[PDB]
């Protein structure tokens with residue numbers, strides 16, 4: 464099944480690359496709303512993207528951004544993606560200052576469900592930034608990454624100093640960011656940020672509750688091997704108490 468640029472009406476830009484641009488878009492015939500990513504073959508990594516799209520086009524999960532298909536011309540490559548009406552988690556955090564434990568734990572559940580669904584396919588994910596986390600019409604979180612396989616603040620010690628312990632560290636930075644309003648190792652300089660992650664030096668403000676500290680503390684281990692299984696995250700009693708979504 465083929466596709467062409469003239470099949471779509473284009474609306475407003477949703478962002479800049481990442482080697483290109485995303486625009487709100489509509490299929491002319493069905494009027495079906497979607498997002499179109501336009502990437503340029505020069506900055507093409509080229510072989511890599513091909514494999515990324517290979518894997519992403521097989522991923523069906525309510526919390527993964529769907530890739531409906533792709534096509535290309537001489538100069539560009541086009542990605543036909545699901546549209547997320549409600550924007551980024553990063554933007555929501557800005558507006559709310561920080562999230563409550565229920566919104567936080569529901570997101571963590573959703574992230575962990577997606578990552579486990581992918582784990583069940585020997586597909587693993589690297590690091591995870593909030594700007595790459597979008598929200599569907601029902602408020603459900605969606606992963607929008609080229610971070611599938613097989614800023615410093617978001618990287619585990621082993622990235623700065625099926626081996627998927629990286630995205631468990633990611634769950635912990637996000638969970639902390641979500642409750643707190645800023646990532647755990649944030650510092651005034653690059654050198655300072657580096658040592659904080661390397662040394663795993665973070666602390667909690669008093670409002671952060673115990674079940675939260677527990678989960679976060681188990682996720683932010685220097686030793687990747689000691690970080691929890693996704694299964695253990697979803698069964699964490701603080702997750703179990705607070706999240707509105709099930710496994």
Ligand SMILES: Cc1cc(CN2CCN(c3c(Br)cnc4nc(-c5cncn5C)[nH]c34)CC2)no1
Nearest residue numbers: 477478479480481483484485498546547548550
């Ligand atoms: C290449 C490239 C990557 C980016 C960053 N980009 C931002 C916009 N993208 C979106 C996608 Br794909 C699907 N749905 C979206 N909904 C929004 C949105 C709605 N209201 C505000 N926003 C930001 N953005 C979406 C994801 C990746 N730019 O060029």
